Design a protein around this ligand. Sequence first.
Ligand SMILES: O=P(O)(O)OC[C@H]1O[C@](O)(CO)[C@@H](O)[C@@H]1O
Ligand SMILES: O=P(O)(O)OC[C@H]1O[C@](O)(CO)[C@@H](O)[C@@H]1O
Lengths: 557, 557
Amino acid sequence: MAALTRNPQFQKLLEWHRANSANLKLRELFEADPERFNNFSLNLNTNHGHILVDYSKNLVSKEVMQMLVELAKSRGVEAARDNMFSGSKINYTEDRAVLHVALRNRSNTPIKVDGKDVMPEVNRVLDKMKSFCQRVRSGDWKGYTGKSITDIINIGIGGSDLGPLMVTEALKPYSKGGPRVWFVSNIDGTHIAKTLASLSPETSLFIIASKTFTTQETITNAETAKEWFLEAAKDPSAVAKHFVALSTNTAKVKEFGIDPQNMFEFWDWVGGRYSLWSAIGLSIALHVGFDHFEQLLSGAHWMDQHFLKTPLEKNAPVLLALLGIWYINCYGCETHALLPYDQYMHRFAAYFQQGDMESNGKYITKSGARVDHQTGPIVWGEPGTNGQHAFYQLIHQGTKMIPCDFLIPVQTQHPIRKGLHHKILLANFLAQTEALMKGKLPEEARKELQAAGKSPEDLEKLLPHKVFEGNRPTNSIVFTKLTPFILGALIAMYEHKIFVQGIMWDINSFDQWGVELGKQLAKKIEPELEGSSAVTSHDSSTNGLISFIKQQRDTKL
Amino acid sequence: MAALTRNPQFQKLLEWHRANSANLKLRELFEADPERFNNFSLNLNTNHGHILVDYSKNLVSKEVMQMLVELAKSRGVEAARDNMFSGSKINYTEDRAVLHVALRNRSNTPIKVDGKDVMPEVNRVLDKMKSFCQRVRSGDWKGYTGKSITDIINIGIGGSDLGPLMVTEALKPYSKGGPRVWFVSNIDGTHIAKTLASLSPETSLFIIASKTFTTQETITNAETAKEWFLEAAKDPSAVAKHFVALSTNTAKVKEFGIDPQNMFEFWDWVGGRYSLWSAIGLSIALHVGFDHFEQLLSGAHWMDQHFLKTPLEKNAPVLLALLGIWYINCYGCETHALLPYDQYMHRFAAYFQQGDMESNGKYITKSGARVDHQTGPIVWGEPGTNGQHAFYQLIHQGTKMIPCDFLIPVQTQHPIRKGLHHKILLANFLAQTEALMKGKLPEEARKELQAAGKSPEDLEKLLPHKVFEGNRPTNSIVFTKLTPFILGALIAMYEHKIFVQGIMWDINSFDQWGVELGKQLAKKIEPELEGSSAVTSHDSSTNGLISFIKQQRDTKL
Ligand SMILES: O=P(O)(O)OC[C@H]1O[C@](O)(CO)[C@@H](O)[C@@H]1O
Ligand SMILES: O=P(O)(O)OC[C@H]1O[C@](O)(CO)[C@@H](O)[C@@H]1O
C-alpha cells in the first residue's frame, strides 16, 4: 500500500468517518454551539489588511480537527516544510530544490542550494526588472523608429502565462501609467493573429516567457511575432529594442536571437506553476509598476512566514489542506470549486487549475508505490454572482458533494452608486454559503407553498422540488481589499495548501512527467498531416480523424 | 427506488459493468477490430460542412452500445423527444412547453402551444430583429447627438449573458461592419464600471436582456447604465435612442421606462439557458449581421432534424448522452471536460456549465421520488493547447476518470504562416486522445531512461513515474470549419444530449428551483449590511462574516 493508507492516524480518521460522519449536521451544529464561528475560524492580521479564513461551515467537529492535525504531524508536514524552506532538494524525481519562497524572501536571510546563497541572484534579477520597468514605463525606452512603448505582449504558455495573466487582471486598478498588456499563449494562430492585428511593430514590446525556452507553442509564437516585426523593421539589430526573454536557458535564448542583456533569468528550483514571483512576473511589474510587484512579493512573504512559524492547529494553509484531505480521502469528493466574488479575479480558478492539478494530479509516491487512494481534485469555478445563474443549481440540488471556497474583498475598487453594487455582491456571497449550509426542510417548503395559495394538489406536486437538503460545506475567505499585498498572501496561501496535501499523499507536487507522452505523439503526427496520402500508422481512430482532416481541409465555406 | 434504477435494461447494464468492465481495454479493443473507428463514429454531412463525432476511444463494445440504446428506448426517449417537438408541456413543474426548437424552425412547419401555432410570432420577432439590425449596422439609427452607434452593451446574467457572449466570441471573424459588443453581467460594480469607462454615451446602445425583467443584478446594472447615460444626455426622452429590452415581461419593461417599440419579445417556453436563438440573440445579430444569425439558427435546425429523424443507434446527441450515462451511472465519474482546440471557443465550456448543470443538476424525479443514482455531471474545461500545460497532468496521471470531449475545426479562421500554427494545433489534438488511450508501457519508458544515460539506481526509481497507464476515454468532435451554421449545429447537439440524459434520469431538465433559496436569503441580508449595528439574526458564521465586513470596510490601506 501507500504511506497515507498505511498511516494509523489516517485509518483512525477513516474509521471515525465511517461510524460518525452521517451524524454531522451543520444546521444543528450551529444551533447547539454559539461559539462555532469563533472556534473554527482564523482572523489573520497582516498589518496590511486582514484575511478571515472562516472554515466553520465545514462538516467537522473539534474531534475531527484534532485527528486531522494529528495526521499532519504523523505525515511529517513540519519537517517537509522546513526542508523546502532550507533549499533541500525535495523535488526528488528531478533532484531539484523547490524555492519559490526564495523569490519573495524580503528578509534576505540566506537560503542555500549546493552550499551557495540564492538571494544575491534573486535580488540581482529583481533590480534588473526594476530598472527595465522604469525605462519602459517612463517612456524613455524607445522602439526602432524612436517612439515610446505602448503595448507589452507576453508570449508563453502554462506557468509562463497563467500567473501574469491572472495577476494583471486582478490588479487592473493599479495599472494607470503602465503600458497595455496582452497575453498570447495558444498555438492556435487565432491567438497571435488577433493580437498582432491591433498592434504596431514600432510601439510593441514582446516578452518571450519560457522556463525551458523550447516549448513548441511559445517558440513558434515567438518566431511568428519576430517575422511580423522584421517584415516592418527590416533590421535584425532592431530586435533588441522589442524582444526580451524570461528563461533559465541562456543558450536557447541566444539561439533565438535575443540580446544577453535582454534576458531576465530564473532558476531550475522555480517551478513554472510557481513562477510569477520570479522574472516571469515582468509583465506584472511593467503593467502595475515595480513598487506594486514588490508589494505582491511582500504579501507572499507574509504568508510564507505564517506557514513557517504558526502551530498547525492555527495555520491557514495547513487547515485548508486538511479540510481538503477530509473531503477527498474520506468523503470521496472529486472536485474543489473556487468561487471569488470579484470580477477582477475571473482568472483565479484557471490559475489554480495548473497550480493544484499539475502539482497533485499524481499517482506514484516517494516510496515508489502506486497510490491506493485519491490524490489531487479537479479544480473549477467562475466568479460570483455569475456562477449563481449558471451552475449553483447543481451545487444546491444535484447529487454531488462539492467543497467550495467563497472569496471576497470587503472593500471594492469601484464603489459606484454609493456602494450599492458591492452591498448586493456581499449579500449574495453571504447568503449562498448560508443557503448551502442550512437548506430548506420539507415542512419549511410546505409552509411557503401554503402561503402562496397553492391547492393541496399543486402543493403536493411541487413540494419535493422545493426542498433543499443542505449540509453542503463551504469555506469563506474574506479580506479587507484586493491589493497587491493581499493578493500575494492569498496566492501563497493556496500554494502552501497544495504543498501540504502533496506531503500527506507522499507524492511529488513539483514535477510534471505526465505531459511528456502527448508532446512525443504530437511530434510524430505533425509531418503526417502534409500531403493527401492516407495515414495507416496509428490506431483506426487516429487514422480516421487524420483522413477526415485531409478530406475536409479544401472544402469552401 | 426511482424510474432509472427500477428499469430492467439499466439493471442489465449495471450488472454487465460489474462483471465485465474491468476487461475493457481501449488498446485491445482497437487491436481486435480494424473496423472500430468505422463502427463507432458518425460522419454527418450537413450540406454546409461535415461534423465527425468519433466515439471510438470510449470504453464500450458493440454489446455495451446495444444495451445503452435499449435503455434509451425503454426510458421513453423517442416519445419524450416527439412531445418536446410537438409543444407538449414537458416542463412539468412549471407546466410549460419546451420550444427552443421552434425558435430556429426554418421549415415553418406549424408547432402549436394550446392549439395555436407559435411560428408567426417567432417570425414576427425575427423580422423586427432584422429591421433593427439594419438600422443600427447601417448607421441610420442615431444616438442623442445624431451620431451612428459604435458600441453595443448587453446587460444580463446567466442565460441572458452566456449564449450571446460565447457566440459573439466564437464568431468574431464574421463581425466585419458590426458594432463592438460588450457584456456586463456581474453585479460586482467592477464589471459595469470598467465597461463604461471606455465608452461614449453618444454612440453606445444598451440591450437589457432578462427573461423575467426582475433579476436584481440585471436591473441594478441597467439602472446604473441609465444614470450614467442621463448624466451626459440630461434628457429622459433620449433614453429611447440608447436602451432596448429583450424580455417576456412587457409590464416590467414598461415600468423600467423602455419604449414599447424598443422591446423584443420572447416566450415562457424559451428556457434562459436555451434562449440565444430568440430575441436574446439580438447582440449576436447586431455583431455578425442578421444573415449570419439566420445561418446559426439553420445549423441548429439541421441538428434538430437529425435528432428527430435518426434511429437512436446512429443519432449523435443520443449516443453522446448514452456514453455520458455509462460514465456517470456505471463508472461513477463526477465530471465531464469540454476541451475545444479553438481560442474563439474559449467560452464554450462556461456556456455548457449552465446548459448542462442548471438543466440536470437535479434530484427529484417526475413521480416526486428522490433519485437513488447520480444525475448531471460537473462540466469544466479550457481550450487546447493551453489545458495541456495546466491540468492534463492530472488527466494523464491522476486518480480520477474524466470523460473528455475534444473539439476542433479542420479549417482555421487564421491560416497564418502557410498553416503552420494550425498543423501544430491539429497534431496536438490528435496526439492527446491517442496518448490518453494508449499510455506508455514500462518497456517503452525503460528504454527511454536507458538512452538518457540514467544509472541503474536512477532508472529503477524514475521508471514508475514515467509510465502512463492510459485507458482514458475520449470523444473527438471534428468539423469542417467553425462557421455560424456549424456552431449552431454543435450547440443544438449538446442541448439534445442534455435532454436525452434528463429523460433517462426521469428529472426535469427545464426548471431551476434550486436557485430560489440563495435569492431568498440574499434579500434578507442586503438591508442588514447598512450602518454600524451588530447583526445577530443568523448562524454564528454568517454573523461573524458580517461583523468582519462592518469592521473592515472603513480601514484605510
Ligand atoms: O433572464 P433572467 O430572467 O434575468 O434570468 C437570468 C438567469 O437566472 C436564472 O433564472 C437562475 O440562474 C437562469 O435560469 C437565467 O438564465
Ligand atoms: O515555461 P515553459 O518551459 O515554456 O513551460 C510551459 C509549461 O509547460 C509545462 O511544462 C507543461 O504543462 C508547464 O509545467 C509549464 O508551465
